[PDB]
């Protein structure tokens, strides 16, 4: 930045820039920045392939031009990729080591050819080709290379461990954990663990070399390698680890040429196989597999069906797995999993395929259930193919029927009763597919008839699975269950209100916020189920408090601390009290893994904060304090305004966040949202959360342009604009952006100025906001202020907080919002060098592709909205307009665009600079 | 190749009659075709088959008869109709306006249009080309169904 | 047909109809035979893949295959698919020929691996190992292969 880099000083900045990358961990700044400004030759751009799936396209441009013969470093780029990608049988097996048998003398850089040789003749285990490296190491004079020398005394081990030599290579392997301890290891607490994480993976496999040599006979060969097992359980499921402690073990147990330890090579063999299948990395998935095959194990042709799967190969995948499957009408081949798996798994994709009619796929279904009925994940895949059969019906011509609606009920309530560890993204389905046939026996139901038995045996469905499966799960469609009580079907608002009961008696503490927010309204029906609701509830044996009263008497004192409007100090004692607050560190529930409860440990409230506070925001908004069960205040903003609003856009949130922690191409990146417990009293006022350590980017911007001195105004700054015309607006937009500096970059410096805490937090800057800039705009965000993008000090998150107006909202007021979402440039170098090209823009396209890939889901969580407001054609069009952004569809003529393409167009046009004049002062640009 | 392109065109009358062959070089040609776009489904004792796949060809195919070189090319060939559906519609809309009636002629090319697209008659969603393939072979060649049929259209044969 | 072949008959018939399949040209008579009634190693399933657009999923299991030193035919298997692949630069690397660095004596099926190895040496234009293929050749006594002859005169001649 100080530099002036219009200059051409960009060459010499930057043969080392993307090296400060390369190794920091971050990949899509590098990939930025390797398209960035750095174009000029081919071969930068061949470098960009090995980091973007298409790795072997760059391995063989690099295999002939690290055959020229007239670099020593562009032989050590090959070497160093082929590592990088665990080709380690193509670097023992290359040209550059063997001129004819040997190599050559005392290592000017040969040192980093020797480590990487040595390294990859430790991984793939051949006494041969390690046991002459050796003999080329140890001819030479004085080793002065502190990485060549660990994996040699690694290779004496190895070496000493094929000849049954237990102390000597326990020898070699202390010596490999001094030459660790002394020269490799570092300082703590000021790395992070994803660089000692190259050195872990070293000391793990040092560890497990000892740990499978001391031992002399098979009785304790066998426990060290369940034990070992054991310690592949803490090791994450990263593929570079493992593969590394896979290979080791692999290398062992092909030195020690007993048969127990060719068993257990077997067993490493089929681990490293499907290892690398789900890491879409099935190169050598294949190759490991084949090992699998001179030992002829009985389960490699199941596993040899996933390589076929996974390479792009349906049928012949499906004929394999037939093939086997008609092999299980033999005899035992144990009947219980090891039957009904295989035959689900053709089934499974039997359907992805494509290649069968629905009534093939149900009639073995069917099978399964008879061959094994005490496993629901038959019964996931069941209501998974009916709750997509009918997606892939009503994208033609169908029209309303109930039976792919009820099989999908009848299978999902018989799921949810075994192992509900997918409660979240199907119960929603379930209850929406329970109201929309029951809603459409009610609408012109005098044939159609059949959808009216079909919502008169589903109803049944639900009381069954009522009254036989857990009681939390239906927690994840309350808000659902709050809306569509009104229901006008009579025989489902009974079991509306029963659900209601159910989930009051066990765990009330965290519902009854909801239920007494229930009986409050301005139309007064909601307030006759809210009595009903709670008659029964006091009807019940338990009844451990008044609380009920003293419920309404919270619910009633906090919606009347928003009319109040002051431009003091009313009841304190009703804190203490069962009720427990309203945070999201309250209200969540655990992620259900297959004895646990559903909830944190209770923070109940404590005492009512007294210190209020006020503020001059647009109508007079407020803010209260609550002390908890661990002394701790918790924020309590207090709003005059529809917030149903504010929770359906946190349960889109909440259904968004979790397909964002769950994708891995989100999990390598880490994206997430924030979040917040939002919470309904009344028509035009609610309750939401405070996220602590949070501030906005004006009180940012202001006290960063007072510390230069820039001066400026409020009221003057907008008169002007009021008094341009249409073309003033550019040159005005021009000169106020000249008058401002941009600063954010340096913000980031005066909270972490311990640079990898800084590094972090802008890389969580960047992509936290990546996410929700178009998660805003495809449900048309709006009034995206800077009083309103906060910025948290802890980590650098981002989270935004107004959202009053959505549904692209903010076009239909004059001087219209005209932007896609706020990119403004002191954002866009805070993202970085590159800016908005970089992982701005990966995260971006990949939060887009996981909204492409989720279409059904989302629009299924925000199909509420329509249902909270009742209306027509101001909230039918809204939805309409969000089904074609999370299409994805340009907004003028209309039809389906890239994920690369729609970000292309919501960033030029987010920071066009003809758009960013156009919009009004309160939204004010130039910062 | 015009195993499926008479089906898709709905082809019928498929009596060993008309179904000629080549001395010369053993080519397949189909010559009466009067009727076409599912007619033989309209009349009593009806055609049910798709293409007349018949004992008599099926070892003429080959060893492994239909599971071989006429299943790949079959596959092609659907996998072409398929690339090429605007075309291939484009080029048969021309029926609609030689008879500019309604109804028994634009349920015609409707059902043309889902064919050639791949959707399966029953349950109407669309299938795959090796599943388009199994579902006319094994639909074909299954001996319920040629049972059934007119003895003009002899099946045993 | 006249077999019949309701019986097993069909395991000696078979291992030489797909080589009259093979080389004949066509691959779905040979895709269509190796698929059905062929079906109980999975080898022959591997052997689907290389004609079907997935041959590399196929050479790189070959191999490790061909890298089990016990049969002498599973690596010529190899060589020959490596062949019809024109992997002519993965051939001449091999470590079937280039023990350290010269090969073995007077040739009972090694005659077929030094016909792939001389080929795929002059369809890859390098004088070091091409010169010195040459050295190996002309180190036998009575050259018998009507197939080695060749590609052995066109190495000389480059
Ligand atoms: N969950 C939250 N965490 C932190 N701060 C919050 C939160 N919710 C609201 N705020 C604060 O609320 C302020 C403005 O409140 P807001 O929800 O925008 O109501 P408002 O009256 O509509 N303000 P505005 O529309 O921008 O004029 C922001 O500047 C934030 O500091
Ligand atoms: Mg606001
Ligand atoms: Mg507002
Ligand atoms: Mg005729
Ligand atoms: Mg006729």
């Known amino acids: 930045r100080q530099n002036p880099h219009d200059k051409n000083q960009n060459g010499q900045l930057l043969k080392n820039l993307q090296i400060t990358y390369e190794e920091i961990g971050d990949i899509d700044s590098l990939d930025g920045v390797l398209r960035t400004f750095a174009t000029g030759n081919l071969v930068s751009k061949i470098e960009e392939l090995q980091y973007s799936e298409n790795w072997k396209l760059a391995q063989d441009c690099f295999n002939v031009l690290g055959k020229f013969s007239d670099d020593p470093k562009t032989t050590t780029r090959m070497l160093k990729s082929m590592y990088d990608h665990q080709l380690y049988s193509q670097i023992i097996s290359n040209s550059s080591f063997h001129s004819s048998d040997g190599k050559i003398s005392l290592s000017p850089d040969v040192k980093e050819w020797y480590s990487i040789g040595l390294e990859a003749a430790n991984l793939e285990g051949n006494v041969q080709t390690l046991k002459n490296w050796v003999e080329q190491i ?110 080791m073990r692999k290398s062992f147990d092909q030195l020690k040429m007993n048969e127990q330890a060719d068993a257990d090579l077997g067993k490493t063999f089929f681990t490293l196989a499907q290892l690398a299948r789900n890491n879409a990395r099935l190169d050598i998935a294949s190759e490991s597999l084949m090992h699998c095959l001179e030992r002829r194990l009985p389960q490699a042709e ?117 192992n509900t560890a997918k409660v979240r993204e199907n119960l929603p389905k379930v209850i929406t597919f329970w109201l929309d046939i029951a809603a459409a026996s009610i609408s012109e139901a005098p044939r159609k008839e059949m959808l009216s038995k079909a919502t008169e045996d589903i109803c049944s469905h639900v009381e069954e699975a009522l009254q036989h499966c857990p009681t939390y799960i239906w927690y994840f469609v309350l808000t659902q269950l709050l809306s569509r009580l009104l229901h006008s079907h009579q025989s489902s608002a009974q079991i509306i209100m029963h659900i209601l009961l159910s989930l009051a008696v066990e765990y009330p503490s965290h519902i009854l916020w909801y239920i007494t927010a229930l009986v409050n309204s301005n139309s007064s029906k909601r307030v006759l189920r809210g009595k009903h609701i709670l008659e029964k509830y006091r009807q019940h044996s338990q009844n451990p408090h008044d609380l009920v009263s003293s419920a309404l ?25 069962a009720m427990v607050v309203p945070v999201r560190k309250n209200l969540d529930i655990i992620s259900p893994l297959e004895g646990y409860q559903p909830f944190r440990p209770v923070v109940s409230i404590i005492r009512f904060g007294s210190s209020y506070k006020v503020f001059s925001s647009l109508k007079k908004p407020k803010q209260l304090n609550i002390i908890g069960s661990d002394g701790n205040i918790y924020g309590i903003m207090c709003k005059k305004e529809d917030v149903r609003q504010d929770n359906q856009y946190m349960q889109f949130a909440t259904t968004m966040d979790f397909l964002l922690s769950k994708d891995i191409a989100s999990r390598k990146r880490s994206l997430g949202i924030n979040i917040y417990s939002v919470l309904s009293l009344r028509e035009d006022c609610g309750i939401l959360e405070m996220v602590p350590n949070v501030v906005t980017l004006r009180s940012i911007l202001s006290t960063k342009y007072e510390s230069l001195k820039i001066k400026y105004s409020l009221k003057s700054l907008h008169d002007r604009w009021q008094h341009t015309a249409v073309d003033g607006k550019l040159e005005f937009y021009m000169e106020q952006v000249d008058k401002f500096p941009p600063i954010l970059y340096q913000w980031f410096l005066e909270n972490f100025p311990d640079p990898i805490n800084w590094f972090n937090a802008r890389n969580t800057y960047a992509r936290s906001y990546a996410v929700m800039a178009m998660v805003g705009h495809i449900l048309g965000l709006g009034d995206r202020h800077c009083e309103n993008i906060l910025l948290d000090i802890q980590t650098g998150k981002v989270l935004h907080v107004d959202l009053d107006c959505l549904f692209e909202k903010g076009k239909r007021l004059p001087v219209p919002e005209i932007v896609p979402f706020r990119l403004t440039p002191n954002l866009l170098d805070a993202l970085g060098i590159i800016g908005t090209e970089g992982t701005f823009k990966k995260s971006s396209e990949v939060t887009l592709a996981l909204m492409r890939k989720n279409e059904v889901a989302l629009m299924n969580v925000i199909e509420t909205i329509m249902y909270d407001r009742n209306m027509d054609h101001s909230i039918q069009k809204a939805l309409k307009v969000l089904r074609n952004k999370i299409r994805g569809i340009d907004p003028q003529d209309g039809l389906v665009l890239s994920v690369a393409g729609q970000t292309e167009t919501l960033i030029q046009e987010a920071t066009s600079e003809d758009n960013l004049s156009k919009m009004y002062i309160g939204w004010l640009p130039f910062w």
């Open 302 to 418: 199941l596993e040899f069906a996933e390589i076929l799967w996974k390479q792009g190969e349906n049928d012949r995948a499906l004929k394999i797995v037939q093939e086997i499957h008609e092999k299980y009408q033999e005899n035992s081949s144990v009947n219980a999993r090891d039957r009904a798996a295989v035959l689900l798994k053709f089934t499974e994709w039997l359907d992805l395929s494509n290649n069968s009619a629905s009534e093939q796929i149900i009639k073995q279904y069917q099978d399964i259930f008879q061959i094994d009925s005490k496993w629901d994940k038959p019964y996931y895949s069941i209501g998974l193919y009916y709750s997509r059969l009918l997606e892939r019906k009503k994208a033609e011509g169908y029209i309303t029927n109930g039976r792919f609606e009820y099989r999908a009920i009848s299978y999902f309530l018989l799921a949810f009763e075994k």
């Open 553 to 577: 008497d919270l619910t009633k004192a906090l919606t009347r601390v928003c009319l109040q409007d002051v431009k003091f100090k009313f009841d304190m004692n009703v804190a203490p009290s």
């Open 138 to 247: 140890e001819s030479l004079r004085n080793i002065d290379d502190r990485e060549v020398l660990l994996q040699y005394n690694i290779a004496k081990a190895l070496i000493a461990i094929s000849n049954e030599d237990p102390l000597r290579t326990q020898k070699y392997i202390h010596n490999s954990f001094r030459l660790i301890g002394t020269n490799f290891i570092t300082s703590s607490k000021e790395t992070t663990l994803l660089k000692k994480q190259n050195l872990l993976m070293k000391l793990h496999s040092l560890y497990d070399l000892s740990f499978l040599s001391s031992a002399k006979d098979k009785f304790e060969y066998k426990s060290n390698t369940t034990i070992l097992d054991y310690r592949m359980e803490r090791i994450g499921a990263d593929f570079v680890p493992n593969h590394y402690i896979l290979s």
